[PDB]
Amino acid sequence: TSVKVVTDKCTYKDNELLTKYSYENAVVTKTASGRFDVTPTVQDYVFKLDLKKPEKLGIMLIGLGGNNGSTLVASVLANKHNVEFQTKEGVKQPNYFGSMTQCSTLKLGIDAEGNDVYAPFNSLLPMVSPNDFVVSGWDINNADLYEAMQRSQVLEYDLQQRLKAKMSLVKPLPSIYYPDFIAANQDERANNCINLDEKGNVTTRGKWTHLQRIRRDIQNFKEENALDKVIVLWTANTERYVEVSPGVNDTMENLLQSIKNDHEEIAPSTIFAAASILEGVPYINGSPQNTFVPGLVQLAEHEGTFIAGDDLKSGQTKLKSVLAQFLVDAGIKPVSIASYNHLGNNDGYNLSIIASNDILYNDKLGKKVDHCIVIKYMKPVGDSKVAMDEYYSELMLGGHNRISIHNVCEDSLLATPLIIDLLVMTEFCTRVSYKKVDPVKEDAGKFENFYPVLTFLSYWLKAPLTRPGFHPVNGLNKQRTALENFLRLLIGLPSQNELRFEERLL
Amino acid sequence: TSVKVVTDKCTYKDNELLTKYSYENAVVTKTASGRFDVTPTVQDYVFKLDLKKPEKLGIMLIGLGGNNGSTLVASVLANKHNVEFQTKEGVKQPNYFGSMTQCSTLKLGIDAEGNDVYAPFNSLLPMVSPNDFVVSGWDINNADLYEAMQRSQVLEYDLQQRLKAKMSLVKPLPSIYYPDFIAANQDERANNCINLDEKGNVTTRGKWTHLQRIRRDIQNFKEENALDKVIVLWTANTERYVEVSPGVNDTMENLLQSIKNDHEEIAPSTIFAAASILEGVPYINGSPQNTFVPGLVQLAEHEGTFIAGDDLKSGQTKLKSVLAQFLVDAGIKPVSIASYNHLGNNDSNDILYNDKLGKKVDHCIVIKYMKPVGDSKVAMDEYYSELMLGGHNRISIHNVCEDSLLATPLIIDLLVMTEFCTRVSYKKVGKFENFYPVLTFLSYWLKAPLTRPGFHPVNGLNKQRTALENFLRLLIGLPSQNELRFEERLL
Amino acid sequence: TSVKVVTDKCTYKDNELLTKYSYENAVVTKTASGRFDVTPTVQDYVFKLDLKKPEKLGIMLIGLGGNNGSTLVASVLANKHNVEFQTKEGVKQPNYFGSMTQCSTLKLGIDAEGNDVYAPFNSLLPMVSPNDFVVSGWDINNADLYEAMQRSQVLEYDLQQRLKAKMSLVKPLPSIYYPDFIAANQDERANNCINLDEKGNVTTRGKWTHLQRIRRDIQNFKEENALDKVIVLWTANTERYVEVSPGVNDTMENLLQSIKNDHEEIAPSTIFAAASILEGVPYINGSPQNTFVPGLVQLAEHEGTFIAGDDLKSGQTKLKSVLAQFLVDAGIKPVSIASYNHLGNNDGYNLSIIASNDILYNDDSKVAMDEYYSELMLGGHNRISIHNVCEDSLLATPLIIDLLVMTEFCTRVSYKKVDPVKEDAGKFENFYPVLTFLSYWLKAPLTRPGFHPVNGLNKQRTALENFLRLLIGLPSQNELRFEERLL
Amino acid sequence: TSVKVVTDKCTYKDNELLTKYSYENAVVTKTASGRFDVTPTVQDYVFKLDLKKPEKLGIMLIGLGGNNGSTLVASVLANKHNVEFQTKEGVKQPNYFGSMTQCSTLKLGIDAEGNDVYAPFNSLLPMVSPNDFVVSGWDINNADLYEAMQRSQVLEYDLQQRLKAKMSLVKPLPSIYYPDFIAANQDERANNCINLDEKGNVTTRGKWTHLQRIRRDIQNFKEENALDKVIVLWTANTERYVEVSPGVNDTMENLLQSIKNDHEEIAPSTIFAAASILEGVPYINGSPQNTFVPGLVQLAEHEGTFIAGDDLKSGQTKLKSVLAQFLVDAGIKPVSIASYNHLGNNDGYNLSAPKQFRSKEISKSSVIDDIIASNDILYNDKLGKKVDHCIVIKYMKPVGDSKVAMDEYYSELMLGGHNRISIHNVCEDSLLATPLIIDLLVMTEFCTRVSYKKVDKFENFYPVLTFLSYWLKAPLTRPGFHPVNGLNKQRTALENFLRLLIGLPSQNELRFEERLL
């Protein structure tokens, strides 16, 4: 499918789309007798979109041999090659269910009877297909992707067998292993490392050489596959937070020298992110550690390359967000949120809204929500994960409400389509540039790319890497709306209002 | 708290607010190929909002002596008189928790730092407070509201006692009882009926006479309380649906005639609705039965009076909505929805669903009666969806709570919004007009939203709230929410 | 694997075992003044057990092509030939998990240090192994068992494939199809029926010829397999209950006559039951219908054959029973019990303790959920919810195996009720045709005219355990452990 | 109601029931060939029961001002004085629901129809009623019991108001406070202590005088209420396990000496235990801590005084055990059990500290091992003797005494199938523990009036009344004996004890009058 809007806001020229958009917002000021003084603001923009998308997109994953990496490669091959497979429920055709860019829809408007008309999320503007991903990456373990699948226990046995021949040919590149950064148990899995000494052992020495090695890898992968575009994504084991100290990783220059100095606060991801930036390739952090120290963020700004992330947002987390928001929107006051969960995969083994509502949360009836988060490792559960979150909330006149959400599913089958989403949306953003219109000075403007931090990806990240003078904004619903309204405006359509006046009125 | 927006779209002349609004949408078409041709549309309006709100809002509940009815009255009194009460957790202050109009907020914009600023949902435009509701109504049982509270077993004992003296003085008016629409359990309890014979017995004969008595009741309630603004809401036992047959209830003329004929397709609710429409007061159906037959809806357009309803949307039905919506918007394909919910009281994506992959979704709906639990009912909903490459996802939603403690603030929300909507009229760009008789704006609070023919009902809980949010916003010269945050995303 | 008890209560003949047992119980009589008068009682018995079990045991399932039937044959074959299979979790070995007789243990006593010593349930006495089951049966649909496995969607794909060659060889015999007894949504699949009229169409007439055909089927099955013993179990779609009518199915002669006269109330299962009894073959009803009408019960008593049943007991039913029991034993008063269910097998498609406690009570992947609301002291409350997810065929199959193993065992046991004042004499008698020892696995136990069908799961396993114990000279379990407490 | 059993086994003298009983069992040995050699064993006994129980039983609770303590007192008063109270569900009558001794029944036999006949658990032999309980006790906090109720938020507001007058007069005695033994966040509460120095500040010096004070406390409570029988029960904050060392607490000699030396391995519970033993009064340990150190156990033996305890088995745990039993007896192999739960009382707030949590963590995994142990068919080196288990107990103040417990089992079925069972449990935890406390006291009293003698001079049960393991999560046993956690087997041992004493044999369930005949 394809979409064509009749608008005077858009002009297509030589695989290039120019769109006018007037951004409206409002600045508020509450004071005195509690009066909210709101002053609307307007800012006109011109968006430019390279309509020409990569025929093939290179993807390089750190942790390629794990559950997510294994599964991501399997899904691209299975789908690209229409690899149907046998299950106890019969033959099945591959798909990308769980992917918003591949399997969700957006409301374009209404037809003749006044009913909504939805179109595929990726049918509005040109987006790259996961079927066109050319995937590679690094892993401290040398097992090929077929062996990786076997070890992960995520995919149907018969699907692994039909993909055996191809997955066996995929081997992860050696990686950077600095033992002290991951969960104890690891020196055994690590058997494919570049950072070796004269005798071929450990070594956290030569971090800048490691950095160079990684940059060569990116250059090699790019040329050997005749790839113009490449994106890097960390989906490896969570590392132990790095301390942010002045003079070391506080600035571009400082960080860069610290790496050269083989400093203790220079983790493997730090080098991967730095190497990607230096190569000009977008870098996404799918783990919770804080690799985006202030010195790295400056580097990206300096280089003018995109970065994003900090922990892939799990399904349970999303649901929690949606659920908590719903209660509050309805004026329900949650007092506690007991969250629990346990899995038996390597991820867990390694791991082995009050502000918006002062009516409910204030200094008279309570401003806090007692909530605990427990994550246990239960090996016999496998990739399958069991999450349970309970909400005990206050209702009117001394009443209470207890809601329990139980969730069971193979974690990696949820994570892989989200990785696909992060990759497709990241590529899409790279082809987007803009320029703010100066009311007074007609021209002179020059297009620019988004701020080096792609917050448009917050939908898929648990802890959004916040830009300096602003606070992170989660709220899953608010996050999809933004993405939806962005595609909309690029094609000359206004944000969704839900007013349906062609029904409520006259 | 108040909100003052600096805009040139908002006018003011004699306690009136005039706001200009350009409504944008887009008509879509599809072709041989999946080619979607979108043609944006526009229509400018001028909305007029009467800022003079009633000092007192009359509320008339059919089923005033039930769980929702008695609880509604107790919440108005407790809050209005700040009746704090004792609980084994300590003395508690009354509130309207569970009420969107009373306890939720709206984002007005950002502050100097770039942070979102939230204001009370009811602080944007003048809205009536439930503390100013004057409540009465009808019930087939003569028990006063103190006796009703005891029967309902909804509220804290101590609160019931501190409210005893006031609730004991509230007696529901006699109502219309047509046994063949509920009966049995609510059969015996019927000792407050107007439809009696000369021998003093319940009769379904003299219906039009029943209509006249209800219109009168409405009139007397206004007079005795010095109110001119009244809203009627159905929160009584569910009735057996009726048949919409031609010549009977297909037109207002036929409808009115059928009532005179003592027709059997004329339920008590048909009579309460009709009498309210005739009295020109808004009527809301908090039950699932098909009250608004075409004849009634016709009569309401003609009289130009608000009608809205069809079942108070319960909490679990709201969770389910938000839940399913979440999944589909994530590219996840729900398959099963084995839903269940027993109580012990008296009461869009063809990518996943298409021909090839299948557009079928088996939905299970169970409701059992088990009195032991009392008002505190328990709901359980289970979803089984398909993930990529043969995997599945199983989500269970368990909910426990006193049903009426969630229904009451929802009734409050409906009444508060219905009143707000009566002070609103618009004009396209002629004289002004009022919303179409069927207030679909209140869909957020009703399971089976009554809609205009040709239109499909949209039940997405979040979209319904968005509509309301955007309505209040536009009335004060604010654009819908874009969530683009370009001051944060763009250099 | 074996157990030897040093005791003078047991004598071993050729292939016989004779065990003396003194049975104690008590009769109680509560006087109006509320007093309980308890008169202890004792009744001595002599049990005889034929130790020579069948080398091969014939099994004939009605509904052989269903989820339970196809899964049963698959389990026997996989375990018998040690067919390991592939899964996401790696290579798995076949087993009989979920089977009490095959995978549970019993406490024999204590060791030197006073510690409990457990032995396999099936090691106390000789019991037939499900690996020695020779299976056949009937089904109104003729798909071979490989196709049945595909249709059921119960087993691991790789296992189905490894079992393909062998399961393909098993085809269910034609069955008796009286459409007026099922849920209708089983009419399209019926293409394997013996009850066909002149024009070859499905008829409800000639029921006596149908019954003789089933007897032919049983005799043939034995003969062709050189089988000595066979058991018949009904694990087919649930039938519509039949109303017991005087002069119709109230007695043996009546029943038999109503069959010859193609009467309305003779269900296909009635004929299967009757044919089995007439062939001296035990018969087990795994469905809820009241197949065992008075007439059938009498025909069985006269024939000296076994009958048992009324609905294979589900895992959630077993669970509820233990839970409710637990609460009542703790003095808690359950006032609410909301049970729920929804499976993924053709079982559902066709689907479309208060007397003990006078103190508190006075004047294929199925998903089950049960919630209990009980009142605690001083007005408090307790809310317990049991959520259960599993492929019920994987639970039913081992339950069917236990039923067949226990039924076979009981057929090798006979007794003599000893008379004190009448030494010697009294030829050994077989259990009462109705086997209440199998109550453990059946949701609605079949019982005698004046007795109440016990459902306490815990008690049902205790009865079975103590039975095996007494047959080898061991007393019942007291749990007194005076080895400690007293000293 | 009462039971009368016609049997030449019972000699009902002048308030002295004498009963003959032959206890059968068997000793097993397993040959390398795989054969079990079982040899039956019998032992005749004579049981003597003092039919004359006390008209009033003295109950002294350590932790009297807590959730359980105040709730127990409230239940006794409400029931004894038939104090009905109001609730949103109407006026209710007080009762002892949740109490096995007051609300469960036992099968006596059958009627003339072959049907089961049940009678009240307490109708067989005389037992003391909780209405005759005379309660007092200690607490490091001086709040009277009405304030203790308000603070616990366990009972109906109206019920508390009705009991306000009488409970305001109940004040706990000063107790012994050794700070380095409790959670931590409790020292602000410690305002009722006996162990105070010259300035009047806590101190761990003089543990023997402390010992002497508790003994006298017992003696005073007894005479002030004209009581003859008293039972002490620990229902206070869980203490940290104590370190049992040689020459300090390995022998009663050492233990008493260590106390006189204010030794640091001598906890407050250790002292209440010793004091109770020296006064000849039964001592029940309701917490998980290892109070009953070997030397203390020795003392109980030498003095001939009953002791019993270690964890007040939450109903949730009892339930988990039953289910795991049902599964293994069904041939189903659990390969994982995830326990979880959060509560907002002082119990949970205390268990926060990992040193106290450890005590509770133990006596949770114990069961799983016995179950794995009983079935070598499912659990062995070949298939795996593995069964994953985790116990998570979070403190969530917003829920109060209402504890929410969730337990999930993942078992393997045949041919690679699996089964997932979830148990969700919610209730006022103290409303389950209180009636449980009542059972332990009634059954302890009952056991004190029971003596025996092996025949072919009477004695008393071994100090450790393992007979009470049904209500104890951490069964306390002997040297060479493993604990029996099978909840079902624990009640049957009780049913069979009572039956036996009245001439009835153990239940067999054979029902030969229905199966045979």
Ligand SMILES: NC(=O)c1ccc[n+]([C@@H]2O[C@H](COP(=O)([O-])OP(=O)(O)OC[C@H]3O[C@@H](n4cnc5c(N)ncnc54)[C@H](O)[C@@H]3O)[C@@H](O)[C@H]2O)c1
């Ligand atoms: N799996 C899920 O369901 C899930 C859900 C939400 C978030 N996450 C996130 O994604 C991450 C990966 O999850 P997973 O299931 O794929 O993990 P996994 O343990 O199966 O795989 C991680 C892989 O990282 C490799 N690795 C570790 N350190 C490395 C290094 N320095 N260089 C290269 N390779 C290295 C390991 O060898 C392993 O193959 C987690 O750490 C977490 O941040 C995972």
